[PDB]
Write an enzyme that holds these catalytic residues in place. Structure first.
Site, short mmCIF file in Angstrom:
data_model
loop_
_atom_site.label_atom_id
_atom_site.label_comp_id
_atom_site.label_asym_id
_atom_site.label_seq_id
_atom_site.Cartn_x
_atom_site.Cartn_y
_atom_site.Cartn_z
CG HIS B 41 -1.62 1.33 1.43
ND1 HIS B 41 -2.56 1.82 0.55
CD2 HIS B 41 -1.48 2.27 2.40
CE1 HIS B 41 -2.98 3.00 0.98
NE2 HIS B 41 -2.34 3.29 2.10
N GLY B 142 -3.24 5.11 9.30
CA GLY B 142 -1.81 5.12 9.57
C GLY B 142 -1.33 3.83 10.20
CB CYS B 144 -1.20 0.44 6.67
SG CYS B 144 -1.06 -0.72 5.30
#
Lengths: 302, 302
Positions: B41, B142, B144
């Protein structure tokens, strides 16, 4: 999204935990600078009779101590007794001492417990100091001296708890780092019992805001109540007073719902949930503080 | 005594968490030896449309990366893509890499999440992988790349999860370190919904034994149902099958209560407790494994 009771990371506190042994008795201590703090239980003689700690302290001999961090032993220079703790001066400073202060918790305060055995951490969890000055944790033999801490917004570690004893009821009792036992309980076996717990209203209000922000609003009540009225109801129904209202402004604004409407809703929900749930809970949840809810939902401090 | 959902201590994992930035996008990576693993990502373009990760990888420029641990800047040597993760080779080895392995979780497995933001840990909590391969955590923007782990008795850290995404439903999805997404969900925004989870019967039995051993027994059914009978009921009521009563021998012996009596209790309780609770839970809890309960309450293994 999600709301989960969590602990602040434990690394900086793990680096301070030590194993403290006196004779055959082993428990945990906290090494900060050149001082190890631990429960005074470690110098108790083996007996079933009442311990006279003044006598135990006077007959204490330094050579009977062994203190170690991760298997590395530290020299013991001197020992003093303060309430229910010992301060053991050791011959070198912990080079991994975090910026820190000591704080005495008040009921309603959240903190983190690092459960330790033989000076090695096994688990970490968030907990709230109850109105009866006890916590509900999970400890088995050897957990004495397990520390509680909070990490302030600025990074400073607040050391606030040292596990002391489990009451007959199962309630857990600790002291602060000054040796004062929370709730003035005895730091040795006894028949003492804690007062009945009161639900932490401030936390229930925070919980209901979290529920609203997740679209759960079936339980909202339209009756009129003010803080004074709620606090009178609370005293009669096993709840604490609500502390204040304005601190909830960030959540009141996001939801369009006033703290007073939530207070009225608490009064109604006291009657029962009628088979329904709020965020999976079938009764009111006082596990989460306002600070926790705002942190977990929005990533900001109050 | 007590039973509380805890995390294993996080220190050794905190030392592996790094901040990974690509362009304006920041998330978390895990630094082991000279490799940082993070969700792919991090190289997605800023968009609302479907991401073509093969294209994003083909156009990747190493200079756009910034990787750091606590102000220690790590030079990026190369990057490869593996399923839903990137492996970023860096110019320095993490000298605090713990003894470790990679492990792919199965439903019913407990593990720990270190929730991190911009490469810095904020919280740690225990979770249990559901039958639909999702978890119920607490994560906001945030998070991730937040790692999940389990520490074995011999001290080996099993790295098992990297946080990937939250579904519209609120369910949390992650990958293993090989880059396979648990449940094979898509690692980008979509309309995907997780299948219904089944209550993990083995874990509920373990939880009820824990309740008994902590003096909570108001819910205990006076009758019994055999394993075959429970299993037919389970198939019709959203519960997993129970396989063998034999692993519970130790707790059945300590409590004097057979698994069959607990199975009958589950059937009576599967709709809720009303306003009552068991160990603080409003409804049956399937978050603890048998091993977890025995380790926490007796400090031993199975």
């Amino acid at each position: 999204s999600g709301l989960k009771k969590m602990a602040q990371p434990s690394g900086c506190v793990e680096r301070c935990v030590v194993r403290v042994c006196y004779g055959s008795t082993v428990l945990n201590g906290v090494w900060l600078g050149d001082t190890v703090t631990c429960p005074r239980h470690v110098i108790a003689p083996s007996t079933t009779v009442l311990i006279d700690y003044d006598h135990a302290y006077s007959t204490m001999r330094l050579h009977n101590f062994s203190v170690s961090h991760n298997g590395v032993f530290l020299g013991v220079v001197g020992v003093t007794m303060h309430g229910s703790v010992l301060r053991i001066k050791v011959s070198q400073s912990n080079v991994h001492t975090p910026k820190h202060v000591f704080k005495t918790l008040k009921p309603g305060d959240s903190f983190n417990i690092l459960a330790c055995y033989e000076g090695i951490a096994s688990g970490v969890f968030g907990v709230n100091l109850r109105t009866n000055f006890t916590i509900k944790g999970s400890f088995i033999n050897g957990a004495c001296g397990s520390p509680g801490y909070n990490v302030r917004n600025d990074g400073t570690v607040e050391f606030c708890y040292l596990h002391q004893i489990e009451l007959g009821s199962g309630a857990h009792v600790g002291s602060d780092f000054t040796g004062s036992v929370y709730g003035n309980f005895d730091d040795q076996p006894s028949l003492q019992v804690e007062s009945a717990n009161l639900m932490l209203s401030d936390n229930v209000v925070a919980f209901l805001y979290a529920a609203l922000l997740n679209g759960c609003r079936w339980w909202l009540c339209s009756t009129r109540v003010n803080v004074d009225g709620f606090n009178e109801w609370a005293m009669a129904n096993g709840y604490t007073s609500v502390s204040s209202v304005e601190c909830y402004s960030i959540l009141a604004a996001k939801t369009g719902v006033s703290v007073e409407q939530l207070l009225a809703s608490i009064q109604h929900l006291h009657e029962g949930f009628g088979g329904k749930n709020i965020l999976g809970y079938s009764s009111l949840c006082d596990e989460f503080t306002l600070a926790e809810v705002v942190k977990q939902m929005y990533g900001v401090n109050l």
